[PDB]
Design a binder for this molecule. Sequence first.
Ligand SMILES: O=C(O)CCC(=O)C(=O)O
Ligand SMILES: [Mn+2]
Length: 201
Amino acid sequence: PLAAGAVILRRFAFNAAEQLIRDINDVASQSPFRQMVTPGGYTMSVAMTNCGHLGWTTHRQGYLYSPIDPQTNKPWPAMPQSFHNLCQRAATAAGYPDFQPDACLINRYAPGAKLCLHQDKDEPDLRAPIVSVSLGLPAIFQFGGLKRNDPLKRLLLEHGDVVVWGGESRLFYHGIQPLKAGFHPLTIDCRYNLTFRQAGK
DNA sequence: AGGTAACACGT
DNA sequence: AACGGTATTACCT
Ligand SMILES: O=C(O)CCC(=O)C(=O)O
Ligand SMILES: [Mn+2]
């Protein structure tokens, strides 16, 4: 096992990938990918957007889940049924049959893009797991512990891989190392990740 | 009190 | 380039 309460389901989303990617494009046509600026004033290397009832965003004052896209000033697009179904099946396979996400953060990684080691704790109900779907180019996922200096596991995540963490491992530090350039026939030159959460009550 | 930015340079 | 400092503070509510 990846950790207590955590598992990787390799190639779980492989068969669903083409549809998922069509729906990413549909979501982004309404709420475009944007590289967000941290409260500290740095532009993130990962480009992001959201779908579902709540979207993760930065602002001057910190991080926030909000029902409105601050760039368009309209609600985030509805969560595609392909996304919701894949998430439900993955969560069930990982031992979290009751998971009901209300938020999906869509990450796009160009070569060089990274996500520094962090915890997912913007969500009030820590009982719900995180379901994380990889698409396109491969990336090295770091998965640690409750403390930043806890030893890291480094796992390659490839197209279609799904990682789920929760319970004892819900607050574990994790991240993505700078993406290697490459080619993938479905995403061409990038990696996408879908991160499903229950962000509200 | 407690929340929490850093989902972001030097060795 | 893997590891860890920084928030060891200065603000909010
Ligand atoms: O891209 C990934 O695999 C991880 C994304 C992530 O950690 C997040 O969106 O909070
Ligand atoms: Mn995360």
